[PDB]
Structure formats: C-alpha cells, structure tokens
Design a protein around this motif. Sequence first.
Motif, PDB file in Angstrom:
ATOM      1  N   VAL A 171       0.879  -1.168   0.000  1.00  0.00           N
ATOM      2  CA  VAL A 171       0.000   0.000   0.000  1.00  0.00           C
ATOM      3  C   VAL A 171       0.926   1.232   0.000  1.00  0.00           C
ATOM      4  O   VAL A 171       1.886   1.274   0.781  1.00  0.00           O
ATOM      5  CB  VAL A 171      -0.805   0.071   1.317  1.00  0.00           C
ATOM      6  CG1 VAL A 171      -1.827   1.228   1.142  1.00  0.00           C
ATOM      7  CG2 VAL A 171      -1.589  -1.244   1.564  1.00  0.00           C
TER       8      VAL A 171
ATOM      9  N   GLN B   3      -3.520  -7.833  -8.644  1.00  0.00           N
ATOM     10  CA  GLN B   3      -4.792  -7.331  -8.540  1.00  0.00           C
ATOM     11  C   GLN B   3      -4.726  -6.049  -7.775  1.00  0.00           C
ATOM     12  O   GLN B   3      -4.068  -5.907  -6.758  1.00  0.00           O
ATOM     13  CB  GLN B   3      -5.711  -8.250  -7.702  1.00  0.00           C
ATOM     14  CG  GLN B   3      -7.146  -7.849  -7.539  1.00  0.00           C
ATOM     15  CD  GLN B   3      -7.826  -7.771  -8.901  1.00  0.00           C
ATOM     16  OE1 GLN B   3      -7.652  -8.680  -9.766  1.00  0.00           O
ATOM     17  NE2 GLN B   3      -8.498  -6.662  -9.174  1.00  0.00           N
TER      18      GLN B   3
ATOM     19  N   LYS C 299      -3.385   0.833  -3.748  1.00  0.00           N
ATOM     20  CA  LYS C 299      -3.279  -0.383  -2.959  1.00  0.00           C
ATOM     21  C   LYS C 299      -3.374  -1.527  -3.954  1.00  0.00           C
ATOM     22  O   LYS C 299      -4.288  -1.625  -4.766  1.00  0.00           O
ATOM     23  CB  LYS C 299      -4.290  -0.461  -1.882  1.00  0.00           C
ATOM     24  CG  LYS C 299      -4.356  -1.849  -1.141  1.00  0.00           C
ATOM     25  CD  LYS C 299      -5.192  -1.925   0.168  1.00  0.00           C
ATOM     26  CE  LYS C 299      -6.706  -1.644  -0.130  1.00  0.00           C
ATOM     27  NZ  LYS C 299      -7.598  -1.834   0.986  1.00  0.00           N
TER      28      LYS C 299
ATOM     29  N   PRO D 231      -7.400  -4.211 -13.106  1.00  0.00           N
ATOM     30  CA  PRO D 231      -7.846  -3.071 -12.389  1.00  0.00           C
ATOM     31  C   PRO D 231      -9.080  -3.330 -11.544  1.00  0.00           C
ATOM     32  O   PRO D 231      -9.720  -4.372 -11.801  1.00  0.00           O
ATOM     33  CB  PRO D 231      -8.201  -1.964 -13.390  1.00  0.00           C
ATOM     34  CG  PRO D 231      -8.673  -2.792 -14.593  1.00  0.00           C
ATOM     35  CD  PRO D 231      -7.977  -4.151 -14.402  1.00  0.00           C
ATOM     36  N   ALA D 232      -9.234  -2.518 -10.469  1.00  0.00           N
ATOM     37  CA  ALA D 232     -10.263  -2.560  -9.467  1.00  0.00           C
ATOM     38  C   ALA D 232     -11.580  -2.242 -10.067  1.00  0.00           C
ATOM     39  O   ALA D 232     -12.537  -3.052 -10.010  1.00  0.00           O
ATOM     40  CB  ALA D 232     -10.096  -1.559  -8.256  1.00  0.00           C
ATOM     41  N   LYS D 233     -11.649  -1.117 -10.832  1.00  0.00           N
ATOM     42  CA  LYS D 233     -12.792  -0.605 -11.511  1.00  0.00           C
ATOM     43  C   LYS D 233     -12.717  -1.235 -12.759  1.00  0.00           C
ATOM     44  O   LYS D 233     -11.644  -1.459 -13.329  1.00  0.00           O
ATOM     45  CB  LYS D 233     -12.837   0.894 -11.714  1.00  0.00           C
ATOM     46  CG  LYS D 233     -12.892   1.818 -10.496  1.00  0.00           C
ATOM     47  CD  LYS D 233     -13.021   3.329 -10.916  1.00  0.00           C
ATOM     48  CE  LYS D 233     -13.748   4.115  -9.869  1.00  0.00           C
ATOM     49  NZ  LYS D 233     -12.726   4.352  -8.780  1.00  0.00           N
TER      50      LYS D 233
ATOM     51  N   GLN E  60      -0.126   5.006   0.195  1.00  0.00           N
ATOM     52  CA  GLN E  60      -1.176   6.016   0.520  1.00  0.00           C
ATOM     53  C   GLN E  60      -2.465   5.488   0.119  1.00  0.00           C
ATOM     54  O   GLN E  60      -2.878   4.458   0.588  1.00  0.00           O
ATOM     55  CB  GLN E  60      -0.815   7.438   0.006  1.00  0.00           C
ATOM     56  CG  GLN E  60       0.483   7.924   0.725  1.00  0.00           C
ATOM     57  CD  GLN E  60       0.572   9.381   0.360  1.00  0.00           C
ATOM     58  OE1 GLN E  60       1.241   9.741  -0.617  1.00  0.00           O
ATOM     59  NE2 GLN E  60      -0.218  10.204   1.078  1.00  0.00           N
ATOM     60  N   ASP E  61      -3.200   6.121  -0.887  1.00  0.00           N
ATOM     61  CA  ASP E  61      -4.385   5.740  -1.558  1.00  0.00           C
ATOM     62  C   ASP E  61      -4.270   4.548  -2.440  1.00  0.00           C
ATOM     63  O   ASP E  61      -5.297   3.935  -2.663  1.00  0.00           O
ATOM     64  CB  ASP E  61      -5.248   6.826  -2.326  1.00  0.00           C
ATOM     65  CG  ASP E  61      -4.565   7.432  -3.555  1.00  0.00           C
ATOM     66  OD1 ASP E  61      -4.322   6.672  -4.500  1.00  0.00           O
ATOM     67  OD2 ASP E  61      -4.351   8.644  -3.583  1.00  0.00           O
TER      68      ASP E  61
ATOM     69  N   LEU F 204      -6.606  -3.333  -5.747  1.00  0.00           N
ATOM     70  CA  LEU F 204      -7.753  -3.263  -4.738  1.00  0.00           C
ATOM     71  C   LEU F 204      -8.169  -1.797  -4.629  1.00  0.00           C
ATOM     72  O   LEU F 204      -9.346  -1.580  -4.401  1.00  0.00           O
ATOM     73  CB  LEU F 204      -7.318  -3.783  -3.373  1.00  0.00           C
ATOM     74  CG  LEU F 204      -6.833  -5.274  -3.313  1.00  0.00           C
ATOM     75  CD1 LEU F 204      -6.390  -5.635  -1.883  1.00  0.00           C
ATOM     76  CD2 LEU F 204      -7.923  -6.279  -3.775  1.00  0.00           C
ATOM     77  N   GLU F 205      -7.276  -0.793  -4.771  1.00  0.00           N
ATOM     78  CA  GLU F 205      -7.774   0.579  -4.996  1.00  0.00           C
ATOM     79  C   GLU F 205      -6.709   1.303  -5.840  1.00  0.00           C
ATOM     80  O   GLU F 205      -5.540   1.177  -5.629  1.00  0.00           O
ATOM     81  CB  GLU F 205      -7.960   1.529  -3.793  1.00  0.00           C
ATOM     82  CG  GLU F 205      -9.082   1.072  -2.776  1.00  0.00           C
ATOM     83  CD  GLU F 205      -9.082   1.839  -1.402  1.00  0.00           C
ATOM     84  OE1 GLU F 205      -7.938   1.911  -0.899  1.00  0.00           O
ATOM     85  OE2 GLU F 205     -10.075   2.360  -0.974  1.00  0.00           O
ATOM     86  N   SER F 206      -7.125   2.087  -6.848  1.00  0.00           N
ATOM     87  CA  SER F 206      -6.212   2.928  -7.577  1.00  0.00           C
ATOM     88  C   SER F 206      -6.118   4.211  -6.864  1.00  0.00           C
ATOM     89  O   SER F 206      -5.046   4.834  -6.755  1.00  0.00           O
ATOM     90  CB  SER F 206      -6.630   3.210  -9.051  1.00  0.00           C
ATOM     91  OG  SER F 206      -6.458   2.003  -9.803  1.00  0.00           O
ATOM     92  N   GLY F 207      -7.376   4.636  -6.559  1.00  0.00           N
ATOM     93  CA  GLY F 207      -7.687   5.916  -6.009  1.00  0.00           C
ATOM     94  C   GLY F 207      -7.275   7.111  -6.854  1.00  0.00           C
ATOM     95  O   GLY F 207      -6.989   8.163  -6.322  1.00  0.00           O
TER      96      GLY F 207
END
Lengths: 223, 211, 240, 302, 500
Positions: A20, A93, A25, A54-56, A22-23, A95-98
Amino acid sequence: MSVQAEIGILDHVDGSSEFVSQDTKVICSVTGPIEPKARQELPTQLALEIIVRPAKGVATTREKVLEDKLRAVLTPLITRHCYPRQLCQITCQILESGEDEAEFSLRELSCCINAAFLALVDAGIALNSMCASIPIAIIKDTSDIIVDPTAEQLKISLSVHTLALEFVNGGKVVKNVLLLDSNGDFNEDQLFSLLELGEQKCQELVTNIRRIIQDNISPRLVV
Amino acid sequence: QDRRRLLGPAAAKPMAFSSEQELSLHTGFIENCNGSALVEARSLGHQTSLISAVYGPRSIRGSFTSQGTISIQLKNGLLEKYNTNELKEVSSFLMGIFNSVVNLSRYPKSGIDIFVYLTYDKDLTSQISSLIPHCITSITLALADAGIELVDMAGAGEANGTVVSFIKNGEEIVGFWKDDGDDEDLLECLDRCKEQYNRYRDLMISCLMNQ
Amino acid sequence: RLEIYSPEGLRLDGRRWNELRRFESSINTHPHAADGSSYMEQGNNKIITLVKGPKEPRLKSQMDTSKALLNVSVNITKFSKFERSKSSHKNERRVLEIQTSLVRMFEKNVMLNIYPRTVIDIEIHVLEQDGGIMGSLINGITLALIDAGISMFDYISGISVGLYDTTPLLDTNSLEENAMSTVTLGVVGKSEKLSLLLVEDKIPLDRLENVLAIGIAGAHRVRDLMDEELRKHAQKRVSN
Amino acid sequence: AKDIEISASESKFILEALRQNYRLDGRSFDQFRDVEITFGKEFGDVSVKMGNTKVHCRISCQIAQPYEDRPFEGLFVISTEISPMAGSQFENGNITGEDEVLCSRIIEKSVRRSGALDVEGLCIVAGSKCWAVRADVHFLDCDGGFIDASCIAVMAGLMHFKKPDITVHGEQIIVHPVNEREPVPLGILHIPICVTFSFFNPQDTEENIKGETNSEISIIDATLKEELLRDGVLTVTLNKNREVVQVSKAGGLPMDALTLMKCCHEAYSIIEKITDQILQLLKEDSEKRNKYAAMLTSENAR
Amino acid sequence: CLPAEGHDWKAPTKLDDPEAVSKDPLLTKRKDLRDKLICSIDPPGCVDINDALHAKKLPNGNWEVGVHIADVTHFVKPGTALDAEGAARGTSVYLVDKRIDMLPMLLGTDLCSLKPYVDRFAFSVIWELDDSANIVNVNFMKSVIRSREAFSYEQAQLRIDDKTQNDELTMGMRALLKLSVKLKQKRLEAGALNLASPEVKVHMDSETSDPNEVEIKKLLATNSLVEEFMLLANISVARKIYDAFPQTAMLRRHAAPPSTNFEILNEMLNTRKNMSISLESSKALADSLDRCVDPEDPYFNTLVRIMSTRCMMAAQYFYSGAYSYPDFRHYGLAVDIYTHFTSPIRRYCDVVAHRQLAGAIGYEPLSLTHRDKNKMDMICRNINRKHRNAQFAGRASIEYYVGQVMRNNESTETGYVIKVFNNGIVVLVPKFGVEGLIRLDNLTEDPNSAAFDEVEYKLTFVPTNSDKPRDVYVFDKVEVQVRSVMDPITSKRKAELLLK
C-alpha cells in the motif's frame, strides 16, 4: 502515512504480498515455478506471464501495455536460468487505484513493481538484486518537481516519471536503470535532476522494504 | 470497448454521408514474406492497387493430412467497404481456382497462408466482380516468386460483371462467375475475356523475367 | 392488466389450477443420421432434440477411462420469439447456465459408466418458446435418451408452477411468466426426491411446501404420458 | 488449467470424518465461519474475509444507454472473473468458465431479477440515460465458501457505495463532484445472503435414487478439498423476511422436499446472524465517516 | 472554512492582546463597547438569539437606542466554501418541528448567537431618538458587546410591569415601549395598514424571519416594541448603502395590488354587504378598511385586511441596477428605499447587505461582488425565489398538522368562507391561520342540488345528515371540522375538511 508492506498474508499460493502506497493499494501473488503451458515453454528460460487487473471495470488493452512495462523490469530481476522450461504466473490485482486509471498510471505501476519484488522474496524464486520503484511528478503551479505525489498533486501535473533501479553490493550501489519512463514535457536539466533525487529517494525505499522483509521473516525462520 | 483491442467511445456512431485497362506488375519489393506481389490497374472508371503476400508452405504437424491446403484471407480496403460475407465468397472462389492450379502433392502436411489486401479502389467517375482479375493476377505472381508449383499461370478477364478464369491459353476454364450481368452474354464475354487472359499472361511472365 | 386467475377457475387460456397444457410428442424425427431423436410439444414450446453418438471422439483429451464425456448444447434460434432475435444467444450466460444445469443433472441420471471412452452430444434445438420452456426442455431430453438406447435410472420430468399468492397454477404461458413469480421443478422417477429445483423470483418459504407438493403430483401426471407414448411406439416396431 | 490431484485416501478420510460427525476445521455441519467486513477508505470498496477465503468487491458506476426491451431499468453486470491467486485451475479470464457463469447468474437472479437493488430509479432519463452499476468481484484466496462469500461481497459493496449527485436540465446531466456535493447512496430493496449446502453421499447413486432413507451428510460452507469432492450441491438464497430469493439445484444428490425445506429453515437462522453482523459493522465504520457530519446537521429541531 | 474555536470561543477584553491582533488585524477598527449594559429581547424558549438591544438616557435629554445585530462577517468571508454553501440554501426554513439551518448548527446557534455572560462580537447600529421620536443621528460601527441576561418576551413584559427595578434595563424597556407607539404611528400616517397585528403578520412575509406558528394567537405589546426599532434601523442602513454605491445596492420591496384581484375582492364585498375598499393610496386603503366594519360578524375588519394583503404583491429582493428611486415603493411600509438586515444568520440577503454596510464604513473594502451589477443580480434572483418557496412551505407545514390535531381532538371550529366555487368552498380557519378547500362532492347527497350564483357569490347545497337545503354565503360563519369520510377512488377512508 507514506508506504506499508506485508508478506505472507495469502496462504494458498507459493508467495504473496500487500503493497500500500497512501491511496494506491495493490495485492500481488507469485505462483510457481509450476508446470509450463506448451505455448509458454521456453527452453533455458523461466516464462513470465504477467496479469494486471484493475479494481474498476474489467481489464483491457491498457493492462497489456502495463504487462510489457512490468515484464521488462522483471526479466533481469528474476534469475531466468534458475528454472528452465517452467512458468511463473504473476497476478497483480489492484484493490484501490484511487486516481483515474486511463489518465495516470504513475502510482499504479510503481506499486505493482514493489509488490512483485516482495512476492517473489516470499516465493523463494532467485532475485539478483533489490528493485524498488518510486513515483516522481512535476506540477505546473510552481513548475517544479514534487517527489512521491498524492492524488491531488497528480491532477495538477504537467508531467510524470517513474524510475526503477537495480541495487547491488549492499543494495546501495546503483547497478543499472531498469526503467525510466518519463511522460509529458521535460527538458534535460530536469531529467538529470529526476535521476539525482531519484537515486536517494529510491535508496530510502529500498531501506524500508529491506527492513520489512527481515522483521516479518525472522519469527518464521528461527534456530 | 473490448479486452483484445481499443475501440474508443461505444455509444458513438459513424458519420452519415452527403483491353481497356493497364495492369502494371511488380514483385519481390518487401521482405518478411516468402514472395509478394503488387498489382495496380488503371482504367477510366477506377484505379486500384492490390497487394498480396503469401506465407509458407508451413508445417502443421501433430496430424498427417492427405495433401496440402490453401487458406485465403481477404482484408477489407482502407477506402473500400464490403460485407464480410462477400469476402468469404470471393475467398471461397479463389480457393477453388487455386486448388485446381497449384499442385499440392509435392508438399505433405502443408498449409499455405495467402493474404489478399484489397487496399485501394478509387472511382474518378456489384463492385467486387471487377477486382477479380486483379486478385487472380496478384496471387499467382506471389505463388510463382515463392517457388510454389503451378499447372499454368491463372488469369482472368472481366466482361460485363462476368468473370471467367482460364488456364492453358484460353482452352480450359477453372472458374466462372456471373453476378448482375445480362442474360445471354456468353459468347461476347468468353471471346472478350480470352483476349484479356492472353494479354495478362505474358505480362506476368515478363515480371518474372526481370528477376 | 388482464386476469391471471378468477374464483371461477379460468385463465385467458382457460386452464384449470391443476390442469396441464397440451402434451404432444412423437419420437424418431431423424432416423437416418441421428441415433435417437424426439419432438416435444408442450403448448407452443416446440423443441426438437437429436442425440448423436455414443461415438468415440477423435481427440484424445475428450477420451476418459472412467466414464463418457457428456455434452449438452442448447441452441436457441432467432425465431423463437415473436420478432427476430437481434442478439447473439449461442454465446450468452443465460444459455450456458441452462447448459451447465442440464448436463450436471443428466450426467447423474444417465449411466455414462457403461460407455467409457465415448462422447455423447445432446443437441437441443428450440423452434419456438411461449414460456414454461425451462421444464419443457428437460422433457424433450428424456424422450431422446430413451429412444437412443442410452441407459438411465428414471425419467426426469419438468413442470412449472406459478404462484399467484397462494394460488398455484400448474403449467405456464408468457403472461403467467411475466406477471408473477414462477417456480420450475423436476422430479426423477415416481420418487418424491427432486432433481432440480430452480427459483428466479421471490417465493415465500412459508409457502414453499404448497408449490412443491402440487408440483410433485403434477410431475407424475406428465410421466405417464411419456410411458404411454413410448410403449405405443415400441409395440408398433415389435409387431412387424 | 491444471487441477489439484488428491489421493483416494483423502477422499475416504473426509467422508469418514463427516460419518463419525466431526469436521477438519473443528466446526459443526451447521456452523458457518465468522465473516469479517473491512470497509475501505472509499465508498463501495469492501474487503470481505471469511477465514482464509479472501474476496474483494469494488463497485463502479458510469453513464450508460438503456437496452431495447426495457429502457425503464438500468444495468447490473456482474464480473466474477477469476485469475490465479487461489489455484491454477482458474486462469486467464474465461478458459472454462463454468463457475464464473453460475456465480454471476445467481448474483444477478438475486439482485436484479427478484430485486435487492432498485432498478427503476436508475433511469436518469428514461430511454436515454441511466446508471450502469458494475460489481467486479475478485477473489484473492479461496478455501471453498465461493457463492456465500461473493454474495456478501456484492451486497456490502453496494450498501457502502455511493454515486454522483446529478441535476438534469433537458438531457444535459450536470455531474457533480464527490467533494462538491455529497454523493447519494444506492437504493436497496432486500438483503440476499447465500448458504450453500454441499451434499455428500455415504452410499453410491444407485442405492440413493430409489431409496428414501435420509442419512445424507448435509454440510454448508465447504473447504477447498470439500468443494471439489462434493457429489452434489443446493445453493439457496434468502432474505431476512422469510422468502427465498433464488434456488439453484441442477445436478448432484436428489433430496425430498422436506429435507430441502429443512435446509432453507437452517439457512434462515444463519442469514439473520450474518445480516446482523453486517449491520453493526457498517454502523461503526459509518460513525467515523459521520463524526463531523453530525455537527453540521441541517435536520435540526425547532 | 468553519472556525476551529466555536464551542469555547470568547471575545477579547483588550484589543492589544497578542493572539487577538493576529486573528483579526482589522480589529483596530472594531470599537470596544462591551462595558455598556445590553440585554436581549427574544421569543420564549428561543430557537436562537438573533439580536440584542439596549436603551440608555444621556443626561442631555436624548434617549439612545442601539440595535445590536449578530456579526457573521468575522467568521465567514465572501467566496469561501461556507459562503458558497450559505448562498446555495438562501434562507433558513422554519417548519412545524424542523428548523432547517442556513449555517451550521454550532456556527449559527452558538458562535454568532449573542449568548448571555459571554463576550461576543456584534455590528452596532446606535442611534439617538428624541422624546417625540425623531432620529437625531445614527452611527454605524463594528463592535464587541456582552449581553448579561437574555429575556423572553414575557419576561420583558413583566419587567415593564415592575416599577421597583429602576436599573438601565427596566427604564430602557419602558422608554422603548413609549417611543415605539409613536414610530408605528408615523408609518400608519404616511399610509399603511396594520401589519403588526398577529393575524395579518402570519399571512404575510416576515420582517425578522420570525417563525409561523402552530396555532395563531395574540402576541404581546413587547412583540410590537421590537418591530419598530428594527424597521428604522433597516431604513437607516438603506440610505447609507445607496450612498456607498447607487446601482448595486441590495434592496427589498413589495408593490400595490393588481386591478383584477383587487376589483374581484371588492366585487364580493359589494354584493355581499355593500362594503368597499380603495386603491387610491395605501392611506386610503387604511382609512377604507377602518370603515368596513359590521358587528354581524366581528372578524369582518380582520378578514378584509388579510384579503388585501394576499392581493398586494409578495416581497421581492432586488437591486438598484435596473430600478430607479421612485420604483422602491412599499404599499404597507410606506417607504421609498429599504433593505433587510436583521439576522444574517437566517437570511442570505441580510449577509449580502451586511458586507456592503461593513464596506460602506471602510472596515473592509467593498468587495467586487457587491460593486458590479451582474454578480449582484444573479444571486438576488435566486435568493428571492428561495424565500417565497420557504414562506409558502412554512404555511403548508402548519396546515397538515392542524389537520392532525383537528382530527385528534375531533373538534369543530368557527371558520369563514372566503371563496365559493360551483363545487366547493375555500374556508379560512383563522384561529390557526390555515386555509383549506372543502370538496362539495364529499359533503353532498346529490351533486345536482348544487345551486350557485356567481354574481352574488352564494352557494346552496343539501348536506348529508340533513334533508333540507343549507345556504353558504361568502364572508359568513360556518362551523368547520376535520373528519374521516370514505374515499371515492379507494375502498378506505381519509380525513377531509368538512362541515356539519
């Protein structure tokens, strides 16, 4: 925070890690050395078949361009001649790009590269050197460099740059530059500035990952 | 979008809209291919350029096959628009001619990959009938350049949207196509297309004579 | 819009609350190129089945020492609706879902054990549907396999119930399907043990017994037509 | 794809463990593993962990065209595409895809067909503009428990999820940022939660089928080895209102209606428990998101 | 952009304190006044403190009154996120048991509230009145106050009825009640109907943003006391800002009735009782409404007064960028220049006017927003609209709840028929202020015994639970109830406004 890393979290796979930043992950697994598919049998070489998802939404063409970028970096990191005629599938994988996935890939990529290193350390596959990668932007407001930028800072970029360097003889002598992908406008005096800073900021990140693997490995392996 | 290719915005829609010929041949001009040919035909009507490339003999092992086979891809031009099905028909047509002209027995476990690029067709003034002489001229040249066996050079005319392909100096027919021509054209067309075949025969032989 | 039922026991087809639809069948519709075949009418659901094989496949990976490989292909053409199907359906999850359900279920009903190094292909072509189609497809399979001489334990028989609150209506059409929650069920043999229960809609759990119990009776009723049809056919070809 | 090769002795052993009335995990046949729900730092990121089985769901929305048949509803599309982080028997998107379809289809049957997510209200402009809501379910670890975990990952994901506040004028949609105005949560009509009963035969098929005895070992919430080794399955899905949302039964061991309904009744207690657990976990994460929102209330007393 | 202190904040004692002159450096221009006694004159169980007031006597024979309005301009600045939010809402909407805040809860009801026993910043308007009640001078400054006790209207009323507390607050309040009745007489004199009566007040737009009640009732001569002092403080401000900039000055008005509403209102009064009202002037209205009385129904004056205020045009906030000075008329407040600043907590307009007033005296600069036309005008339009919807909504909110209570007590109460239709009547219930349509349909035994004359305004139907015809006249008493009746389009009942 800045960065956090864990290994060993997944249990069914040969090695794994959670990176991780920051944003951003990324959770990673290395599976193998395992039985080759016939199309991915290479004679003297370990095969790499990398997947970035990607997450999305669902993986597209973008993740192949990323796969190539990852594959470039990983081919001299993993000792190819260590296993002949075996495949390793590395499955990364997000889990967040943010952030915004098509537009910026700066944080996404840097994170994958690091989670791949860790996963491979947990896996036990030979690794010649330490690799980490750091994300570097330049914002238009001051018209200058900001190291390890946040999501907000990425929006206001004019340009963005990832570097990865191969770390030997104490993990502190830069052997080689395995990547330097500099996108947006730059001229040369910035670019050698991005190396210079880049050097020292990588070597800190190497210290932090180095430290993490020792602490997490040490209650496992005991004498 | 799609997983194999970028297709951009998908709710987006296209734009709505508002011997009489000279064939000059060329070969052996691009490399990564066993032989290539280029046919440009100019006429009052329309000017056209067709590229062909032939890949292999290739081995297709893990199975024994009685004899070799021929596989034809037509690729839609970059300035001509056709239905995929018509390209299939014409691929099927050309395969059945080539089946008869290429000798296939010197090559066990063979597949040959033929590509027909129907790149440019431009009118200064169906349509797919007209370019059949040019496809047949191109591909033959390519099979010859590579060193693929052939009974006779294959070549055809187009008289009144009717295409007749012959081998052996107009004597034998290896294919016939009639689509939207007039009833009872038979004599005019066969006479007229024989002239055309004998005329492009020698052109291909003279292309093959510079090498 | 429209009545689905009344206290007077009618519909707009005019069926009764435990009345079945028109069941017509005949077997051997392809007796020159298919090992068994059967035609199934339930209502206007017009289903043709062919069984092709038992035959060995000519690919080694499809060979299996322990049992036959079974393939069930559910093909749905473009004229099963009232209009032309604009979509591709032979590459859709809804259809793969039916495939995965019929195959796993008939895989245990059929003995594949007595056909090692075989592949069987069941080929199910729908010509029209007017709903109650998910139970109708099972029934067509069942007559095809018994015709083809492919051994089995029992007849699975598919039947649908639509619950109009507490009012269970045995057999269904397009209106019934689209205007309430439908249950689809199958029973194997004259057993009370259910092979297949499929529910796509809110059916209460408190009323879960009422819709299955009438359906397991309703199933027995379908199964005796299947026997009657079959023995009328077998008697014909043993007189001659 | 390449599958796990277990022994004959393993196959014998796990059956005998059920026969003599234990489990490997030290569980009971009726005991479900504790699910922990870890809500993200963003809306609709949910990490869903049940013991070693680790699954995630991330929700996304986009502006999208309705479909031709019913343009008065929006779109729910479920990607339960799986990559090798649990084995090598799942690889490269679809490569066999039997399990993909079944999990995807049941989750659709639960949330879109029955309702458990509002769809009428997904039309921003009927026949023009709608929300498309995409659930992308990604497993990172698996130790059986596949459908159960995936479902919880879909509904917690959707409940924590929120979507841009929109204003229409004409057909022009002014999309408003999620710092600009506060994003709006989805509509929820019900709470489907699955419970998958994995059925194991102590006999063989032939003795089962015209026998009438019940002595079938009923277990839920199978392990990885159990998932492979099950002779049959019942996947039944209920909501916390005594209604069965969907049932998928199609192959495996047959069962009397009474026994099937038994199953349903057991699951009905277990789903209030998971639903409860989910409720109070959501609350306590929400309290931290609400901590100055409580101060800045505009719903106040006179 | 909400200040971090705001639950513990107190204002400085010295304006030479370290921290204080770093927080506000404009602070040297903010007068220390906190040592003069102030008290606040507020609603019983106040929803917040919007104001504070004092009156003191100068030995030189002047009475000095200060209107001490809450200061929102040290905590919120224009173009901030809080400001942008505040602008978006535009008004604070009072409902029956919901109050829907314009500013956050702690900012609006704690910080900017002029709490007792806590030092707090204010904007002072301090003005001297002679005994005969004419403004001798008027000051505009920023300030620092404290209020020492916050009184309710009742307490303030009782402190007027004591005579043995002869502190500044008591004497203050007595002189304020003395001055006030003169100031009100000036407004009536120039040409106005009473608006200070409770009854009129509730069916019209608010001057302070006062809540519309649960049940409308007589309110006190102390309620009337604080209306006039605010009115004249608003008027003093109006003139100043107009001086500060004359084409982007924030303003408010209402206008004379149209011909057709007035003409039709009079027509009903004419045919019914041969009583009539005038459209000459607002003076001639006041004189004519005075002369329209009957003891046949004793609410007759009250009722025509209400009707006149409905036909009179609603308050519109605006700017002087497109209107000239003769166009700033008021047809009940009798002024030719006006603004509203009473409470920048509740009302956005008051905050616009505030910032312009602070810039008028050079405390701030005038901000760009308030000194060009078009930035002023867009906002004027929005906030104008938002106030009407709010006021309408506060009345609607009363109406459906009095439908609950009327049904729960199962009461029947004296209303007046204000409109008479060919298949209904509109009944005004003015002991609660609500209006509702009674559908004749639900209150008849046969729709074909409905006899309506449109030129006379008089209905006749035969009721259900009578066998004989009942006349219903316009402007006469009827006994109205809220009672369950069966639905015509459902198979259940619903509670409808109905007569016996």
